[PDB]
Amino acid sequence: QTNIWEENWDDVEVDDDFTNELKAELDRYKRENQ
Amino acid sequence: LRPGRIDRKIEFPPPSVAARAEILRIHSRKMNLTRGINLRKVAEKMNGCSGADVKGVCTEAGMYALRERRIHVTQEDFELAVGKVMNKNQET
Amino acid sequence: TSILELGQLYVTMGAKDKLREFIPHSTEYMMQFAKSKTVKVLKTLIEKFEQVPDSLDDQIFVCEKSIEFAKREKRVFLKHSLSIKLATLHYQKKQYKDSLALINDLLREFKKLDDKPSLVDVHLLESKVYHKLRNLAKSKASLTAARTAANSIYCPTQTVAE
Amino acid sequence: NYEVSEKAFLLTQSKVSIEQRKEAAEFVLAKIKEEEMAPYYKYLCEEYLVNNGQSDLEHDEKSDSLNEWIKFDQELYNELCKKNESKIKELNEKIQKLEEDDEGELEQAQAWINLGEYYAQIGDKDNAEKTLGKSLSKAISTGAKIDVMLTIARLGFFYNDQLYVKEKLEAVNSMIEKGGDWERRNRYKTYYGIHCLAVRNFKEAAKLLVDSLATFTSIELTSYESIATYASVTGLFTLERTDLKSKVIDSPELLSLISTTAALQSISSLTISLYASDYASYFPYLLETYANVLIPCKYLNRHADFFVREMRRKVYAQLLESYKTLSLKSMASAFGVSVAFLDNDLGKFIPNKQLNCVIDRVNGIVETNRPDNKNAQYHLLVKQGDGLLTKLQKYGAAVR
């Protein structure tokens, strides 16, 4: 996997930010629903 | 001057812009500066100035630049410092 | 002397806009008399357009005129004072871009390429510029460079107050 | 090189907009006309290749490519080869005359540097180095060594490369510690604040990157907003309330560029908006920052989620430190978001443990934890010696 990344924790995971933004819409949109 | 007291009788000139410009380029060298600086012009500004008075310019250009919030120093400060040291060269 | 008043009456008319474009000629027409007359009066007129308040344009527009109509004549001379106002216009316009770039010219101009007394003034403005920029040491710098070199000169009691 | 490498990056990142694609190679498509960029623009057209970088007159032309601007012509090369050879031939005998006349020391190295810088324009990662070496071979000035910095910086950062350059950056700055007197430390810390910004900087040169400005920038290796942007965000996303609200609270630096680029609008902007201790406002501001900041810029994208959830987490520290007793409901519910989903990644901070947060799903309530005598102080103690003890075991592991 490449050479030198920022390394650990580990790569953790991904597909969150947008998933969040999706909900950052939705949550807020839900809060807009609110 | 009778030799054995001073054997080799030697006289130190000139100096001039060039001496100072170098002396300037020496003193301004130490201080962090701003590129595009022409020291000859600065020393061309220099008249009736000397190698220790050259320090004055670099101090004043530094005085300027440190007052410019600059550990660098532009060229203008020096030529400004010249006249300002040319002040004290001519003043008192 | 009318175009002073009548100018403000021109302004009162908006014939300021007449007189705007006449100021290029009032330049010439005071240049028809004298330059020191002109430079004194020319500014004053547009200054009087600043009073009886003007859009920044007719100021800038006609300021920019006499600034260049300095240049067009022979004049490099205190079109920067005009430009001080223009930068001040820019400062009123809050274009510190326009101010400072001009100011820095105004500086380099007033840096003994032009008047050290006006150099104090532009600092003060530039300070304000900086201060409106909230560039504070800068505002300070200029202001001190104003105020310190203000001790070198005399400044308008206004400026002193300022 | 700069825009090159970025408009490389930009389109090589093209995801959001065809313009992310478009705008990038747009210039490049002209910039390859500007400079004979092919030899890397060659591989640069293999760079974003096998995604949308798949449309080229030389490498690959594919429909799944949304970028056709990753196209060539051999004219580019002929032009290039001409340009190159022209450039080459020019300096050739010139440098050879610099050799012939024994002409200049750096002046010899001069047309070398010229020889080299072509490769920057060219996108040749080769002779320029050797040229630089043979420039540096002719280098009697740390200013020519400065040019090594430039060169190596133009080397790596033409690809936004990594270590050797950084290593060189060390090596080149290692020689004389001067740092271009006041400056090249800038370039050092600048590029260093980019080097280490691969992908990290995180605490490290983020400060440094924040620190000196604008005392250089490079053109071909960087703009000034660049560092400002970059310096901010990491140092921002990393450094302290205090620090930030000491520094990015604002700087005349900032005050200058604030919204000047809109190329921010967010970074500490929406973060001090966060640092205003918002809940919801900042919750978009993130991705609002993100896609406006992170995806946009080389490391800013490449690191990705390092940022994402920490400030997400972070505020909760505030939110905690406010409340011993906080209802997560009052948080997650009364903050008008997904309770659970918020809570989930928030719960994903339980194992990341940076929560002192003592938190409910059911009653939806948050509590704290505290260092006390444990701290890490009387806490960490265990391991620290242990590792030593290991090394001490290692110590005795020598014997003979």
State whether residue C111 sits within 8 Å of chain B by CB: yes
Spatial neighbors of C158 by CB under 8 A, at least 6 apart, are none
CB contacts of D283 in chain A (<8 Å) are 24, 27-28
Q: How far is B70 from chain D (nearest CA, A)?
A: 10
> How far is residue D273's CA from residue D285's CA, in Å, rounded to a whole number?
9
Which residue, among D199, D198, D197, has the nearest Cα to D231 in the 3D structure?
D197
> How far is residue C153's CA from residue C22's CA, in Å, rounded to a whole number?
35
Residue D259 and residue D303 in one domain:
yes
Chains that touch B (3 or more CB pairs under 8 A): C, D
Q: Pick the last residue of a domain from D288, D322, D356.
A: D322
> How far is residue C130's CA from residue B78's CA, in Å, rounded to a whole number?
25
Residue D200 and residue D346 in one domain:
no
Decide: residue D348, CB within 10 A, 0-12 exposed, 13-18 middle, 19+ buried: middle
Q: Which three-class secondary structure state does DSSP give residue D271? A: helix
Q: Pick the last residue of a domain from D288, D304, D322.
A: D322
Question: Does D386 reside within a domain?
Answer: no
State whether residue D309 sits within 8 Å of chain A by CB: yes
> What is the residue type of B56?
G
With CB atoms and an 8 Å threshold, state whether B67 touches C141.
yes
| DSSP notation for D109-148 | HHHHHHHHHHHHHHT-SSHHHHHHHHHHTT--SHHHHHHH
Question: Does D396 reside within a domain?
Answer: no
Q: How far is B76 from chain C (nearest CA, A)?
A: 10
For residue C83 the two structure tokens come to 């430009």
Burial A1-33 (b: 16+ CB within 10 A, else e): eeeeebeeeeeeeeebbeebbebbebbbeeeee
Residue D222 and residue D337 in one domain:
no
Residue D24 and residue D11 in one domain:
yes
| DSSP notation for chain C | -HHHHHHHHHHHHTTHHHHHHHHHHHHHHHHTT-HHHHHHHHHHHHHHHHTTT--HHHHHHHHHHHHHHHHTTT--SSHHHHHHHHHHHHHHTT-HHHHHHHHHHHHHIIIIIS-HHHHHHHHHHHHHHHHHTT-HHHHHHHHHHHHHHHHHS---HHHHH-
Which residue, among C102, C36, C19, has the nearest Cα to C75 in the 3D structure?
C36
> How far is residue C81's CA from residue C94's CA, in Å, rounded to a whole number?
18
Give the orientation angle of helix D185-195 with respect to helix D224-238, to 10 degrees: 60
Q: How far is A33 from chain D (nearest CA, A)?
A: 9
Range of D355's domain? 323-369
Decide: residue D110, CB within 10 A, 0-12 exposed, 13-18 middle, 19+ buried: buried
Taking only Cα atoms into account, the Rg of chain D, rounded to an integer number of angstroms, comes to: 26
Residue D149 and residue D256 in one domain:
yes
With CB atoms and an 8 Å threshold, state whether D163 touches A4.
yes
Whether the Cβ atoms of residue A31 and residue D337 lie closer than 8 Å to each other: yes
> How far is residue D263's CA from residue D72's CA, in Å, rounded to a whole number?
31
Residue D360 and residue D294 in one domain:
no
Which residue, among D134, D264, D364, B67, has the nearest Cα to C137 in the 3D structure?
B67
Whether the Cβ atoms of residue D208 and residue D232 lie closer than 8 Å to each other: no
Q: Pick the last residue of a domain from D322, D339, D355.
A: D322
> How far is residue D316's CA from residue D319's CA, in Å, rounded to a whole number?
4
Question: Does D380 reside within a domain?
Answer: no
Whether the Cβ atoms of residue D28 and residue D71 lie closer than 8 Å to each other: no
State whether residue D18 sits within 8 Å of chain A by CB: no
> How far is residue D227's CA from residue D236's CA, in Å, rounded to a whole number?
12
Which residue, among D32, D122, D134, D129, has the nearest Cα to D84 in the 3D structure?
D122
* Contact flag for A and C (3+ C-beta pairs < 8 Å): no
Helix (H) or strand (E) holding D344: helix D339-347
For residue C86 the two structure tokens come to 């223009």
Q: What is the dihedral sign for C-alpha B54, B60, B61, B63?
A: positive
Residue D158 and residue D210 in one domain:
yes
Question: Does D398 reside within a domain?
Answer: no
Whether the Cβ atoms of residue D279 and residue A28 lie closer than 8 Å to each other: no
Which residue, among C155, C113, D247, has the nearest Cα to C127 in the 3D structure?
C155
For residue B57 the two structure tokens come to 């310019």
CB contacts of A11 in chain D (<8 Å) are none
Whether the Cβ atoms of residue A30 and residue D337 lie closer than 8 Å to each other: yes
Spatial neighbors of A29 by CB under 8 A, at least 6 apart, are none
For residue D348 the two structure tokens come to 């994903």
Residue D345 and residue D235 in one domain:
no
Place of tokens 């800013």: D300
Which residue, among C65, C71, C58, C85, has the nearest Cα to C25 in the 3D structure?
C65
State residue D326 phi and psi, 5-degree precision: -120, 130
CA trace torsion B58, B63, B64, B70 (10° rounding): 90
Q: What is the DSSP letter of D263?
A: S
Q: Which three-class secondary structure state does DSSP give residue B44? A: helix
Whether the Cβ atoms of residue D338 and residue A28 lie closer than 8 Å to each other: no
Q: Tell me which chain B residue has its CA closest to the CA of residue C111.
A: B80
D358, β-bridge pairs? D367
Give the max Cα distance, chain B: 55
With CB atoms and an 8 Å threshold, state whether D303 touches A6.
yes
State whether residue D181 sits within 8 Å of chain B by CB: yes
> How far is residue D325's CA from residue D312's CA, in Å, rounded to a whole number?
19
Is the N-terminal amide bond of D24 cis, ω within 30° of 0? no
Residues in chain A: 34
D367, β-bridge pairs? D358
Long-range contacts from D244-250, C-beta under 8 angstroms, 24+ separation: D244/D268, D244/D271, D244/D272, D244/D275, D245/D272, D245/D275, D247/D210, D248/D210, D248/D272, D250/C134
Residue D249 and residue D364 in one domain:
no
Whether the Cβ atoms of residue C38 and residue C81 lie closer than 8 Å to each other: no
Which residue, among B32, B36, B42, has the nearest Cα to B72 in the 3D structure?
B32
For residue D121 the two structure tokens come to 């324009």
Residue D64 and residue D196 in one domain:
yes
Is the N-terminal amide bond of B15 cis, ω within 30° of 0? yes
* Contact flag for A and D (3+ C-beta pairs < 8 Å): yes
Q: What is the DSSP letter of B1?
A: -
Helix (H) or strand (E) holding D366: strand D366-367
Question: Does D374 reside within a domain?
Answer: no
* Contact flag for B and D (3+ C-beta pairs < 8 Å): yes
> How far is residue D94's CA from residue D113's CA, in Å, rounded to a whole number?
12
- Angle (nearest 5°) at CA D226 between D220 and D230: 135
> What is the residue type of D127?
N
C-alpha pair distances (Å), C70 with each of C114, D3, D391:
14, 42, 81
> How far is residue D54's CA from residue C51's CA, in Å, rounded to a whole number?
65
Chain D residues whose C-beta is within 8 A of a chain C C-beta are 250, 252, 255-256
Residue D241 and residue D206 in one domain:
yes
- Other CB atoms within 10 A of residue D240 CB: 10
Whether the Cβ atoms of residue D40 and residue D259 lie closer than 8 Å to each other: no
Q: Residue D180: CA atoms inside 13 Å, Cβ hemisphere, count?
A: 23
> How far is residue D319's CA from residue D325's CA, in Å, rounded to a whole number?
10
For residue D250 the two structure tokens come to 């604002």
Residue D174 and residue D227 in one domain:
yes
> How far is residue D10's CA from residue D28's CA, in Å, rounded to a whole number?
11
Question: Does D388 reside within a domain?
Answer: no
Long-range contacts from D144-151, C-beta under 8 angstroms, 24+ separation: D144/D106, D144/D109, D144/D113, D145/D172, D145/D175, D145/D176, D146/D180, D146/D184, D146/D187, D147/D113, D148/D172, D149/D173, D149/D180, D149/D184, D149/D187, D149/D188, D149/D191, D150/D187, D150/D218, D150/D221, D151/D113, D151/D116
Question: Does D397 reside within a domain?
Answer: no
Method: cryo-EM
Question: Does D284 reside within a domain?
Answer: yes
Chain C contact probe: residue of D249, D256, D257, D259 with most C CBs at under 10 A: D256
State whether residue D204 sits within 8 Å of chain B by CB: no
Chains that touch C (3 or more CB pairs under 8 A): B, D
Q: How many folded domains does chain D comprise? A: 2
Whether the Cβ atoms of residue C154 and residue C120 lie closer than 8 Å to each other: no
Q: Which three-class secondary structure state does DSSP give residue D31? A: helix
> What is the residue type of C70?
A
